[PDB]
Amino acid sequence: KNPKSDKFKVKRFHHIEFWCGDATNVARRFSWGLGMRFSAKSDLSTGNMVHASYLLTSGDLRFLFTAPYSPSLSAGEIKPTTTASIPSFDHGSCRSFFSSHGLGVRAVAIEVEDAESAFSISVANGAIPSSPPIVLNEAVTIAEVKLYGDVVLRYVSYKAEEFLPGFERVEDASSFPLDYGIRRLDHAVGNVPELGPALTYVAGFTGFHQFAEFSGLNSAVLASNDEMVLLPINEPVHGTKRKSQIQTYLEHNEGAGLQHLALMSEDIFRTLREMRKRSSIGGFDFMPSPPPTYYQNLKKRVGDVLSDDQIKECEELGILVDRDDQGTLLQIFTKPLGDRPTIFIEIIQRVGCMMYQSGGCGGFGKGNFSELFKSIEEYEK
Amino acid sequence: KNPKSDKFKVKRFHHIEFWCGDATNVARRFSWGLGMRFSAKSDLSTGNMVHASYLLTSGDLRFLFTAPYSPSLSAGEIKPTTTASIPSFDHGSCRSFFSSHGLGVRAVAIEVEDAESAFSISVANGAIPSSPPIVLNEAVTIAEVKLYGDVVLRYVSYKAEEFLPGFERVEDASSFPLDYGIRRLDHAVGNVPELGPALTYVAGFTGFHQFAEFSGLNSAVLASNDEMVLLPINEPVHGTKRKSQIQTYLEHNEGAGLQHLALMSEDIFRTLREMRKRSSIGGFDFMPSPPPTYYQNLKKRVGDVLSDDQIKECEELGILVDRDDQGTLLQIFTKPLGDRPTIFIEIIQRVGCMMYQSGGCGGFGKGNFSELFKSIEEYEK
Ligand SMILES: Cc1c(C(=O)C2=C(O)CCCC2=O)ccc2c1c(=O)n(-c1cccc3ccccc13)c(=O)n2C
Ligand SMILES: Cc1c(C(=O)C2=C(O)CCCC2=O)ccc2c1c(=O)n(-c1cccc3ccccc13)c(=O)n2C
Ligand SMILES: [Co+2]
Ligand SMILES: [Co+2]
């Protein structure tokens, strides 16, 4: 069931913005680890005396890394005379965010038809305003409302049809064309103390509907009309034998925030080969692999979708597989992206639901909680 | 002239500690960019609820990257019950340092015979105490005094004869054996507003002597008895046609701090080949190369030290060459290591002064200020 209840026209995920202490080092690490190209910049060299912002791209995936400069460089500016390219940026907010939460996602940005309308309708329907609509160079409108914790949902709309005015394309010499196959953001997941109030709030101001589904958590997924913007939310389940990873997140993050970004690959085997080659030379580490019992059990579960060789390739790379009533999901999780056991990345590829592929084909892998549990006990035997 | 006036027994540079917002991402970037191996850690996985600290090594060079966790994880601790492995660490100091200065060096650590004695003698001779001597596991003593700005000179002494108690050696799987030829810290350089008072202060409490030398700055070099610990200091020269890079540093750094680390390579050609291969894939960028006039002029200056092929290899890699009355210096400078135009790295190799090689052989490259100026005008013609 999809009531198509969006209160404003939503297109696709546009970008994810990380708030950093040093944007250069995080961006360079992420570029090498994920195979993303340096695409645009806004910093001292482009006249921005307020913040350093670096954009990485892979296909349609856009990761932005932003850090504040010394406020002294811009102490004579006021908002009408600002040299910031992102007018919602605030030195104090950014330092406070980073000191509270560590490295993490500040903004989940979606492209909409009209960011001013999206903002107005959102706030009229209960959204907490974070940054009012501002028109940049008569070309792009950006607005922000609170999503959960200190994460904002950012609306971006373009008059035309390059990232944002005031960003400059990066010189080709500094722009090595890395590509490990990642192509777009599939979903972005928040952790909260209480799922109910978080869902009611977000669904209330967006009109996003609950996406039909089918340890240590309860979850639900909010989706736009064409189910291409997917915003799952988790809450902890307390009292369990094993401590909830959602609760650990909330403790180390100092509350609610973005838990994981799931990045679609056009070839998850190539993506994982390339990422695993770089894990110990500056890239990202992956969660410990499931026991061989897990891959022995894949024949019964997905032997009609994956060949024995493709299954054994999943086993070499530690890839998990789950299945819906409509499609199949290949997925794997990185270790946390930074110092704290908080945000991590998921790499996914979806098989099925061809019409274009429909959103959320194969689900989100919740069946892998029981399958992992089973395969662990089976391997113990 | 070397009066050998050290007020306590100094051995060698021991490590450099960076204070970070996220130690993981900075350490992984530096590891790949410089060819340093992950050697030790102190973090949540080792029981440290206070700070995340990661040690990189290349030869005798030790770079430590430290960031604070949420204070909530350790809110019940007091100093007698701390789980920090570096007892001088303070959440507030670290956040304040990073918010003021951005990514940069907090501690220049030298190994001494007796860190408690070094501390006491230093303070008795004018050093501003920063952290009193603390004995770790009855095995290592660490103490800190102010050096300049918010940079401390850290004394470390060992009863024995592994990094520090509470650090664990890094698993081999996570410890890829990168090596681009870097072998030790040659010198560590501070920028200050006024050279005179800074020299008087540091030489006053160390007994370090002025190392015999032979644009936009005045400088002097303080040296230990065997001239193996080398601490140059720069001040800006104002009114110049071109704005002093020392003054730009002080503005963007919010005052005095560490300007550059010079890392000795056992093969600067290999080091620069390896670093330049990685500049645009997560590593470090280098300053723009000098004009070919500079390398045309190298024959007259160092043609008795470098062959034509070795000179042309300097030209391919952008390496600068200077000469003392005793030796020759090969050097090159990176672009700033992070967002701010503040700290950068120098790669150096020294030729001559064989006895072992004596410290500071060939100087610090101050002759390259005029040689670069000349070669630029000559290439314009
Ligand atoms: C994050 C995730 C997803 C997922 O993507 C998802 C949504 O997108 C939206 C719905 C809720 C939802 O969970 C799916 C399966 C997962 C995990 C996941 O994180 N993990 C864990 C990985 C590593 C260490 C763990 C430690 C304790 C507990 C779980 C750990 C799993 O095992 N499975 C099986
Ligand atoms: C840092 C340095 C050293 C050096 O290592 C040293 C000591 O160790 C101790 C004594 C003082 C001292 O300077 C030597 C020569 C240098 C530079 C240096 O930084 N630069 C610059 C590089 C790039 C952009 C510049 C822009 C403006 C002005 C100078 C720029 C140079 O050109 N030369 C020639
Ligand atoms: Co997911
Ligand atoms: Co130098």
PDB file of C-alpha atoms in Angstrom, chain B residues 55-181:
ATOM      1  CA  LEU B  55      50.253   5.901  16.618  1.00  0.00           C
ATOM      2  CA  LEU B  56      51.834   5.815  13.151  1.00  0.00           C
ATOM      3  CA  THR B  57      55.496   4.959  12.659  1.00  0.00           C
ATOM      4  CA  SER B  58      58.020   5.106   9.839  1.00  0.00           C
ATOM      5  CA  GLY B  59      61.507   4.167  10.939  1.00  0.00           C
ATOM      6  CA  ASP B  60      62.088   6.212  14.090  1.00  0.00           C
ATOM      7  CA  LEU B  61      59.402   8.773  13.215  1.00  0.00           C
ATOM      8  CA  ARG B  62      56.365   8.564  15.513  1.00  0.00           C
ATOM      9  CA  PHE B  63      53.166  10.501  14.768  1.00  0.00           C
ATOM     10  CA  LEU B  64      50.390  10.293  17.380  1.00  0.00           C
ATOM     11  CA  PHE B  65      46.801  11.358  16.577  1.00  0.00           C
ATOM     12  CA  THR B  66      44.472  12.040  19.510  1.00  0.00           C
ATOM     13  CA  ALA B  67      40.837  13.128  19.776  1.00  0.00           C
ATOM     14  CA  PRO B  68      38.432  13.329  22.726  1.00  0.00           C
ATOM     15  CA  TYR B  69      35.423  11.091  23.232  1.00  0.00           C
ATOM     16  CA  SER B  70      32.202  12.381  24.763  1.00  0.00           C
ATOM     17  CA  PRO B  71      33.046  13.415  28.355  1.00  0.00           C
ATOM     18  CA  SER B  72      29.957  11.439  29.389  1.00  0.00           C
ATOM     19  CA  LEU B  73      31.837   8.150  28.901  1.00  0.00           C
ATOM     20  CA  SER B  74      34.274   9.060  31.686  1.00  0.00           C
ATOM     21  CA  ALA B  75      32.155  11.441  33.771  1.00  0.00           C
ATOM     22  CA  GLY B  76      32.512   9.224  36.845  1.00  0.00           C
ATOM     23  CA  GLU B  77      36.294   9.115  36.636  1.00  0.00           C
ATOM     24  CA  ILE B  78      38.714  11.286  38.575  1.00  0.00           C
ATOM     25  CA  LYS B  79      42.414  11.621  37.846  1.00  0.00           C
ATOM     26  CA  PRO B  80      43.293   8.816  40.337  1.00  0.00           C
ATOM     27  CA  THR B  81      40.827   6.496  38.529  1.00  0.00           C
ATOM     28  CA  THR B  82      41.372   7.710  34.951  1.00  0.00           C
ATOM     29  CA  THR B  83      41.312   5.361  31.981  1.00  0.00           C
ATOM     30  CA  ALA B  84      43.265   7.838  29.831  1.00  0.00           C
ATOM     31  CA  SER B  85      46.641   6.526  28.733  1.00  0.00           C
ATOM     32  CA  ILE B  86      48.035  10.053  28.411  1.00  0.00           C
ATOM     33  CA  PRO B  87      47.381  11.640  31.821  1.00  0.00           C
ATOM     34  CA  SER B  88      48.015  15.184  30.568  1.00  0.00           C
ATOM     35  CA  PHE B  89      45.009  14.897  28.250  1.00  0.00           C
ATOM     36  CA  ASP B  90      42.022  17.114  29.024  1.00  0.00           C
ATOM     37  CA  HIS B  91      38.739  17.165  27.071  1.00  0.00           C
ATOM     38  CA  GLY B  92      38.310  20.910  27.455  1.00  0.00           C
ATOM     39  CA  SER B  93      41.907  21.721  26.532  1.00  0.00           C
ATOM     40  CA  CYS B  94      41.722  19.525  23.455  1.00  0.00           C
ATOM     41  CA  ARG B  95      38.410  20.903  22.206  1.00  0.00           C
ATOM     42  CA  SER B  96      39.613  24.451  22.915  1.00  0.00           C
ATOM     43  CA  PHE B  97      42.899  23.856  21.091  1.00  0.00           C
ATOM     44  CA  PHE B  98      41.176  22.398  18.053  1.00  0.00           C
ATOM     45  CA  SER B  99      38.465  25.053  17.896  1.00  0.00           C
ATOM     46  CA  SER B 100      41.105  27.814  18.151  1.00  0.00           C
ATOM     47  CA  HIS B 101      43.852  26.456  15.911  1.00  0.00           C
ATOM     48  CA  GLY B 102      42.311  23.691  13.798  1.00  0.00           C
ATOM     49  CA  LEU B 103      44.259  20.489  13.169  1.00  0.00           C
ATOM     50  CA  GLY B 104      47.811  20.845  14.401  1.00  0.00           C
ATOM     51  CA  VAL B 105      50.599  19.782  16.712  1.00  0.00           C
ATOM     52  CA  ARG B 106      49.887  19.880  20.449  1.00  0.00           C
ATOM     53  CA  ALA B 107      53.091  18.189  21.646  1.00  0.00           C
ATOM     54  CA  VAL B 108      56.696  18.056  20.489  1.00  0.00           C
ATOM     55  CA  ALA B 109      58.032  15.144  22.538  1.00  0.00           C
ATOM     56  CA  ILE B 110      61.718  14.556  23.217  1.00  0.00           C
ATOM     57  CA  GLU B 111      63.171  11.576  25.060  1.00  0.00           C
ATOM     58  CA  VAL B 112      65.281  12.547  28.064  1.00  0.00           C
ATOM     59  CA  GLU B 113      67.210  10.684  30.721  1.00  0.00           C
ATOM     60  CA  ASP B 114      64.828  11.666  33.537  1.00  0.00           C
ATOM     61  CA  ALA B 115      61.559  13.435  32.730  1.00  0.00           C
ATOM     62  CA  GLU B 116      60.954  14.457  36.341  1.00  0.00           C
ATOM     63  CA  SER B 117      64.381  16.088  36.548  1.00  0.00           C
ATOM     64  CA  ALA B 118      63.948  17.701  33.123  1.00  0.00           C
ATOM     65  CA  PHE B 119      60.614  19.135  34.281  1.00  0.00           C
ATOM     66  CA  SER B 120      61.972  20.422  37.596  1.00  0.00           C
ATOM     67  CA  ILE B 121      65.074  21.993  36.046  1.00  0.00           C
ATOM     68  CA  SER B 122      62.998  23.486  33.234  1.00  0.00           C
ATOM     69  CA  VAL B 123      60.511  25.126  35.590  1.00  0.00           C
ATOM     70  CA  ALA B 124      63.301  26.283  37.918  1.00  0.00           C
ATOM     71  CA  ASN B 125      64.744  28.007  34.835  1.00  0.00           C
ATOM     72  CA  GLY B 126      61.556  29.740  33.694  1.00  0.00           C
ATOM     73  CA  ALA B 127      59.502  27.085  31.892  1.00  0.00           C
ATOM     74  CA  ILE B 128      55.743  27.473  32.319  1.00  0.00           C
ATOM     75  CA  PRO B 129      54.483  24.115  33.639  1.00  0.00           C
ATOM     76  CA  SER B 130      51.769  22.434  31.621  1.00  0.00           C
ATOM     77  CA  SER B 131      51.519  18.933  33.074  1.00  0.00           C
ATOM     78  CA  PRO B 132      53.534  17.662  36.044  1.00  0.00           C
ATOM     79  CA  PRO B 133      55.645  14.499  35.886  1.00  0.00           C
ATOM     80  CA  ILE B 134      53.537  11.357  36.116  1.00  0.00           C
ATOM     81  CA  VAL B 135      54.971   7.843  36.292  1.00  0.00           C
ATOM     82  CA  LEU B 136      53.055   5.376  34.117  1.00  0.00           C
ATOM     83  CA  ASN B 137      53.041   1.727  35.259  1.00  0.00           C
ATOM     84  CA  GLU B 138      56.345   2.318  37.096  1.00  0.00           C
ATOM     85  CA  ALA B 139      57.971   2.324  33.669  1.00  0.00           C
ATOM     86  CA  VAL B 140      57.668   5.646  31.808  1.00  0.00           C
ATOM     87  CA  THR B 141      57.653   9.223  33.081  1.00  0.00           C
ATOM     88  CA  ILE B 142      55.970  11.996  31.101  1.00  0.00           C
ATOM     89  CA  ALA B 143      55.922  15.742  31.818  1.00  0.00           C
ATOM     90  CA  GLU B 144      55.015  18.835  29.790  1.00  0.00           C
ATOM     91  CA  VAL B 145      55.986  22.521  29.749  1.00  0.00           C
ATOM     92  CA  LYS B 146      54.767  25.264  27.441  1.00  0.00           C
ATOM     93  CA  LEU B 147      56.840  25.718  24.287  1.00  0.00           C
ATOM     94  CA  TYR B 148      55.002  28.437  22.315  1.00  0.00           C
ATOM     95  CA  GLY B 149      51.340  29.197  21.783  1.00  0.00           C
ATOM     96  CA  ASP B 150      49.400  26.119  22.871  1.00  0.00           C
ATOM     97  CA  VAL B 151      52.218  23.756  21.860  1.00  0.00           C
ATOM     98  CA  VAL B 152      53.925  21.889  24.695  1.00  0.00           C
ATOM     99  CA  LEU B 153      57.398  20.411  24.923  1.00  0.00           C
ATOM    100  CA  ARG B 154      56.813  16.908  26.270  1.00  0.00           C
ATOM    101  CA  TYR B 155      59.533  15.067  28.179  1.00  0.00           C
ATOM    102  CA  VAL B 156      59.480  11.260  28.097  1.00  0.00           C
ATOM    103  CA  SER B 157      61.904   9.010  29.961  1.00  0.00           C
ATOM    104  CA  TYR B 158      62.020   5.232  30.198  1.00  0.00           C
ATOM    105  CA  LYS B 159      63.327   3.036  32.982  1.00  0.00           C
ATOM    106  CA  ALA B 160      63.978   0.228  30.492  1.00  0.00           C
ATOM    107  CA  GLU B 161      66.822   0.070  27.943  1.00  0.00           C
ATOM    108  CA  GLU B 162      56.156  -0.299  24.090  1.00  0.00           C
ATOM    109  CA  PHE B 163      55.194   3.271  23.132  1.00  0.00           C
ATOM    110  CA  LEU B 164      53.445   4.096  26.396  1.00  0.00           C
ATOM    111  CA  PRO B 165      51.748   1.889  28.992  1.00  0.00           C
ATOM    112  CA  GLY B 166      48.130   1.321  28.096  1.00  0.00           C
ATOM    113  CA  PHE B 167      48.840   1.409  24.365  1.00  0.00           C
ATOM    114  CA  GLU B 168      48.391  -1.887  22.552  1.00  0.00           C
ATOM    115  CA  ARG B 169      50.373  -2.965  19.508  1.00  0.00           C
ATOM    116  CA  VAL B 170      48.143  -2.952  16.419  1.00  0.00           C
ATOM    117  CA  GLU B 171      47.083  -6.296  14.931  1.00  0.00           C
ATOM    118  CA  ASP B 172      49.130  -7.163  11.843  1.00  0.00           C
ATOM    119  CA  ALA B 173      46.018  -7.407   9.673  1.00  0.00           C
ATOM    120  CA  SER B 174      45.210  -3.769  10.471  1.00  0.00           C
ATOM    121  CA  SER B 175      48.948  -2.921  10.191  1.00  0.00           C
ATOM    122  CA  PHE B 176      49.879  -2.772   6.503  1.00  0.00           C
ATOM    123  CA  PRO B 177      53.673  -2.307   6.182  1.00  0.00           C
ATOM    124  CA  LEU B 178      53.708   0.926   4.187  1.00  0.00           C
ATOM    125  CA  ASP B 179      57.104   2.581   3.850  1.00  0.00           C
ATOM    126  CA  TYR B 180      58.074   5.405   1.490  1.00  0.00           C
ATOM    127  CA  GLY B 181      61.516   5.906   3.074  1.00  0.00           C
TER     128      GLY B 181
END
